[PDB]
Amino acid sequence: NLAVPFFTSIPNGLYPSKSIVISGVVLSDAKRFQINLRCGGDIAFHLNPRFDENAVVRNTQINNSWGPEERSLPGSMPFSRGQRFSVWILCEGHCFKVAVDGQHICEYSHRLMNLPDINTLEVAGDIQLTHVET
Hints:
Layout: E1 6-9, E2 19-26, E3 33-39, E4 42-50, E5 55-62, E6 65-66, E7 84-91, E8 95-100, E9 103-109, E10 120-125, E11 127-133
């Protein structure tokens, strides 16, 4: 079942060289969607395209408190309403590397380093989810 909100395990948690791939289609009336890599009560990595803001927000939530957002992009907004997408998240020792449709869009330095405990993937929001690899 690929209904959203979608949850699944990341076997063995995160470690350097582990890849997560999220494929789907942005809804034509989308406001936002989110991909969360969760550990317990924290969100290690929140990847959050916002179509009203024309932004891709990255952040971390610890004990229910959000940190400072990261929003830098090398070019234009890499998701579009109604458009198919493939998100590739690569875990390294110091950061996540994120590509969309093969285009590198950002690095995000780890704020939570307990990588094996980051063992739940959540995908939620205004998309049709078509494939997950964890």
